[PDB]
Ligand binder design. Structure first.
Ligand SMILES: [K+]
Ligand SMILES: [K+]
Ligand SMILES: [K+]
Ligand SMILES: [K+]
Ligand SMILES: [K+]
Ligand SMILES: [K+]
Ligand SMILES: [K+]
Ligand SMILES: [Mg+2]
Ligand SMILES: [Mg+2]
Ligand SMILES: [Mg+2]
Ligand SMILES: [Mg+2]
Ligand SMILES: [Mg+2]
Ligand SMILES: [Mg+2]
Ligand SMILES: [Mg+2]
Ligand SMILES: [Mg+2]
Ligand SMILES: [Mg+2]
Ligand SMILES: [Mg+2]
Ligand SMILES: [Mg+2]
Ligand SMILES: [Mg+2]
Ligand SMILES: [Mg+2]
Ligand SMILES: [Mg+2]
Ligand SMILES: [Mg+2]
Ligand SMILES: [Mg+2]
Ligand SMILES: [Mg+2]
Ligand SMILES: [Mg+2]
Ligand SMILES: [Mg+2]
Ligand SMILES: [Mg+2]
Ligand SMILES: [Mg+2]
Ligand SMILES: [Mg+2]
Ligand SMILES: [Mg+2]
Ligand SMILES: [Zn+2]
Lengths: 115, 122, 207, 9, 55, 119
RNA sequence: UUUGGCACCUCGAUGUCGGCUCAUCGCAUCCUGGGGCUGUAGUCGGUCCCAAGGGUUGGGCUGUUCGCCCAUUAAAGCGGUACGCGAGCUGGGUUCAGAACGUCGUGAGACAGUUCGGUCCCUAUCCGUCGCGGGCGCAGGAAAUUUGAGAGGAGCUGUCCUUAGUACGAGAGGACCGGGAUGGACGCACCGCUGGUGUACCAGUUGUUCUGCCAAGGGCAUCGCUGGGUAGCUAUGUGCGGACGGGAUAAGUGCUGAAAGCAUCUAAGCAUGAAGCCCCCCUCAAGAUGAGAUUUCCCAUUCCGCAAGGAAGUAAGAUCCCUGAAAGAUGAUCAGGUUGAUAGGUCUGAGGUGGAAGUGUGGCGACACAUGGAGCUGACAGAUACUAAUCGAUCGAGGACUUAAC
């Protein structure tokens, strides 16, 4: 990729994010604005993908909520995320965990790493 | 992305279990409906004893979809299923309980009773 | 009217202050130079001729070198006119820079659309296919050429042929950021043409 | 190749 | 679809206006002086760019 | 982009592997020009492995080079030649291990022929 | 546009219903725009006038056209174009040979009665349509930038909020005009985002076969299969558009005003007034032979000739040939051709894959862990003359006459 696009966008890259990879469990603290009030909704879930480069990098987290799978895809460097905290590092064998979309319950379990 | 013939789970206790989409509302040749859009639909499967009966034509608001929805901040939400809630003309749900998480987009369209009844709004 | 010539670098995105994610096109427009002023007396209409992008001497010719002598500049790769401008605001040799624009300003952007080569009626004119089964031998063909009675096809029966490579204007794009040091405009949305292609950025005509 | 032909019965 | 009328000698000859060969892109070989295709090894003597190739 | 050379993916791979080993053994082959042009990159990348010289490099090359005798006297394989003779020759040169010279059309099908050789 | 009447073209063949694909035209207007009258309070309507700019849905049933129905919609217009379009498609029906039912017939058989089944050929010559080159022209030869005669495109419209629960109305209900917001359908561009594809990217895996064996690999099995995926191309994805106005008008409304002491929109005179007309907006455009304009470059050579002309070598400049892609069927276009980053290679990255081999350790072993976000990596970025863009050659002005002003 152009150094020029890299240079224009460098200022908007967040530095405060922890290293995570697909299979890690995050709590993503999302700024939310229902009404005029501002509050933090937490989205806890498995990272199922992380694609793209630089300011365009996104990640997707998946949770089962009330018996329904939910995925939220965020720009890595969105200012709408207050913070990300890694709950547990998973042991997976690939970059994209789309096979989890078809699994529920015990079949959908990811082993932890001592990282 | 819900169109004519798309079947949806019903995310409420109105009596309908599954509906078939008869029509996306809101303009002449409109192909597709998304979260927060209203559809006309027929009840294909019903719970025995419910208020809403099999074969009834009803309005419903879509509250989750597999296609999901994009937000102005460049984030997305998707669900594992397509689901709707049977409504009256004033947007109030015909049932008394909503099951499963609904999308924040329903606040924007002024489906407040649904948003209040939902166990989670993501 | 105001305007400048640059190259399309590519696309990226920028977070707004409200946190909205704005896709942007990056146009790099090193200072354009006013090479000529056409006047109503001499030329019959008022315009300035902007040169952009210094060209190596080997790649120039004597007619070009002479034309850019008055502006006291190197030979330019791209030369375009702007009509509607304030004639008194410009002088031959004057540098026109990206900071003529400011963030929030509404612009029209003009460039040559990417080339697609020879394309059929489905891709080129957005026509329907015929059925793919049920015995069809009518898939990606262009439809009846017309009725019998004229003994001929009317002009504007659309058919296959070369697609793209056309001048295209997109109206009412917003300048998101101007970077004067790097000579960049960042424009909300997408604009015509391949990367490295010449883009003209003008103040919007419907403003 | 038609069953009957042009301007069939 | 078949020709509705035969083509006259004249129309046949007009059509063949552009049915021609061009002269080869040829240049004198600096080594041996025979003509060669520009940017190819000279077949006669096997030189290219003042070097023997077929050594 | 890259050329298809009128062949299926597998056929094209087979042919590029064949030509690559031919050029290692012979050090100069004659072929169609469009084949020569495709062969340059493929061959120069094998020489890069040879210059690396490590076992991982040799096995990457072994996945591509054909099992052919490059020298009957010494019983040297094409792979052994690549990793010894060719690699040593081009220790100091940084890329551009081949050159294409054009010959002109062959009788038979007018195909523009070329010599490709190691520099 | 119907059913017909007539039998004029076609029986050395004018394929025949419906649908599909592609439209285009008329206006007797379905919607939207403008109006007059109303048994027009308002909201709705009715009826007539102007108006063809754009728009005018998806399903169930039936071969169906039509029609009925469901659900929408601003609206679900009516007609023409060989019942538009079968050398464009379909072939359900109709319209051959088989078979059957009812029926008629002594019978063979018959029925715009029904039923199940039943070969849809053609390499485009010409015009025409859509693209793309070559030639010459345009009183010298060139390199750019242009004017716009003229042509094409676009032209649709909902809902909500507000004005205002105001006007109107017994109430029920409930506006105009004017602000603002946000959609549907349609179109243009583009890949940053979400996705799709991605057969010379990465990984897992079955069988068998080969590299002597182990280990590690290759071949074939749809790319063997399976999980991902870069560039590119893409829509369902993103951005943007039909804005704001001028000018002249239609129906309509008039003002002033006589013919005709009054009255009268009209005869003189003066206004107003539609989504329509001409512009405004987007694109093509001087072969616009009416061949336009501006800026800049070359420079008046040599030889034949009584000159008129002719030939030759050149200038500015361009091309052949070559490296290619942002271009592309091929030509063309564009970036380059050595004081050159044009392409490959190389080096460094990005992205993708997801943890190489080897070795070690642990385990009886399958395997696990470490070394180490490793190894590998088409097309993407930057750098670097290492390789190839060699050496050449070809083309290309010297500018007619007349008159007028200088
Ligand atoms: K006949
Ligand atoms: K046919
Ligand atoms: K015909
Ligand atoms: K003809
Ligand atoms: K994309
Ligand atoms: K001209
Ligand atoms: K290892
Ligand atoms: Mg990544
Ligand atoms: Mg279709
Ligand atoms: Mg087919
Ligand atoms: Mg005619
Ligand atoms: Mg294979
Ligand atoms: Mg008669
Ligand atoms: Mg005949
Ligand atoms: Mg009328
Ligand atoms: Mg008829
Ligand atoms: Mg017909
Ligand atoms: Mg026909
Ligand atoms: Mg049939
Ligand atoms: Mg009988
Ligand atoms: Mg009959
Ligand atoms: Mg009968
Ligand atoms: Mg015009
Ligand atoms: Mg990309
Ligand atoms: Mg993609
Ligand atoms: Mg083994
Ligand atoms: Mg075999
Ligand atoms: Mg076999
Ligand atoms: Mg001219
Ligand atoms: Mg290079
Ligand atoms: Zn020679």
């Amino acid at each position: 990729m152009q150094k020029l696009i890299e240079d224009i966008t460098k200022e908007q890259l967040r530095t405060d994010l922890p290293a995570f990879r697909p299979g890690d469990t995050l709590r993503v603290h999302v700024k939310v604005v229902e009404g005029n009030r501002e509050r933090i909704q937490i989205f806890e879930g498995v990272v199922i993908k992380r694609r793209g480069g630089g300011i365009s990098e996104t990640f997707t987290v998946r949770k089962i909520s009330y018996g329904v799978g939910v995925e939220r895809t965020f720009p890595v460097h969105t200012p709408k995320i207050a913070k990300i905290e890694v709950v547990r590092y998973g042991k997976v064998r690939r970059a994209k965990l789309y096979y989890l979309r078809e699994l529920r319950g015990k079949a959908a379990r990811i082993k932890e790493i001592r990282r | 992305m819900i169109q004519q013939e798309t079947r949806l789970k019903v995310a409420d206790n109105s009596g309908a279990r599954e509906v078939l989409t008869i029509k996306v509302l809101g303009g002449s040749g409109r192909k597709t409906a998304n979260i927060g859009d209203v559809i006309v639909c027929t009840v294909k499967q019903a719970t025995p004893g419910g208020v809403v009966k099999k074969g009834e034509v009803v309005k419903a608001v879509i509250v989750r979809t597999k296609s999901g929805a994009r937000r102005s901040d460049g984030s997305y939400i998707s669900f594992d299923e397509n689901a709707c809630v049977i409504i009256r003309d004033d947007k109030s749900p015909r049932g008394t309980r909503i099951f499963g998480p609904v999308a924040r987009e329903l606040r924007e369209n002024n489906f407040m009773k649904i948003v209040s009844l939902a166990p989670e709004v993501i | 009217t105001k305007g400048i010539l640059g190259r399309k670098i590519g696309m990226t995105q920028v977070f707004a202050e409200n946190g909205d994610l704005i896709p942007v096109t990056v146009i790099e427009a090193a200072p354009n130079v006013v090479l000529q002023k056409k006047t109503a007396e001499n030329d019959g209409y008022e315009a300035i001729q902007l040169g952009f992008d210094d060209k190596r001497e080997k790649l120039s010719n004597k007619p070009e070198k002479g034309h850019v002598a008055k502006a006291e500049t190197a030979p330019k790769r791209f030369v375009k006119e702007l009509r509607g401008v304030e004639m008194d605001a410009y002088e031959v040799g004057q540098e026109v820079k990206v900071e003529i624009f400011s963030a929030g300003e509404i612009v029209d952007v003009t460039g040559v659309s990417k080339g697609k080569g020879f394309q059929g009626a489905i891709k080129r004119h957005g026509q329907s296919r015929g059925p793919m089964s049920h015995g069809s031998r009518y898939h990606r063909r262009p439809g009846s050429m017309g009725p019998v009675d004229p003994n001929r096809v009317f002009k504007g029966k659309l058919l296959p042929g070369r697609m793209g490579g056309e001048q295209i204007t997109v109206q009412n794009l917003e300048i998101v950021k101007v970077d004067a040091e790097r000579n960049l405009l960042l424009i909300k949305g997408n604009v015509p043409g391949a990367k490295k292609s010449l883009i003209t950025v003008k103040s919007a005509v419907k403003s | 190749r038609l069953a009957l032909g042009d301007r069939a019965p | 679809a078949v020709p509705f009328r035969r083509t006259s000698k004249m129309k046949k000859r007009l059509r063949r206006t552009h049915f021609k060969l061009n002269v080869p892109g040829m240049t004198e070989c600096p080594s041996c002086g025979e003509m060669k295709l520009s940017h190819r090894v000279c077949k006669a003597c096997g030189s290219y760019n003042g070097k023997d190739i077929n050594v | 982009s890259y050329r298809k050379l009128g062949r299926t993916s597998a056929q094209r791979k087979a042919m590029l592997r064949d030509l690559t080993t031919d050029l290692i053994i012979n050090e100069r082959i004659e072929t169609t020009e469009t084949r020569a042009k495709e062969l340059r990159s493929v061959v120069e990348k094998m020489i890069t492995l040879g210059k690396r010289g490590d076992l991982h490099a040799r096995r990457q090359a072994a996945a591509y080079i054909r099992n052919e005798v490059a020298n009957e006297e010494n019983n040297q394989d094409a792979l052994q030649k690549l990793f010894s003779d060719i690699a040593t020759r081009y220790e100091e040169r940084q890329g551009g291990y081949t050159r294409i010279m054009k010959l002109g059309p062959r009788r038979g099908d007018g195909a523009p022929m070329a010599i490709i050789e190691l520099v």
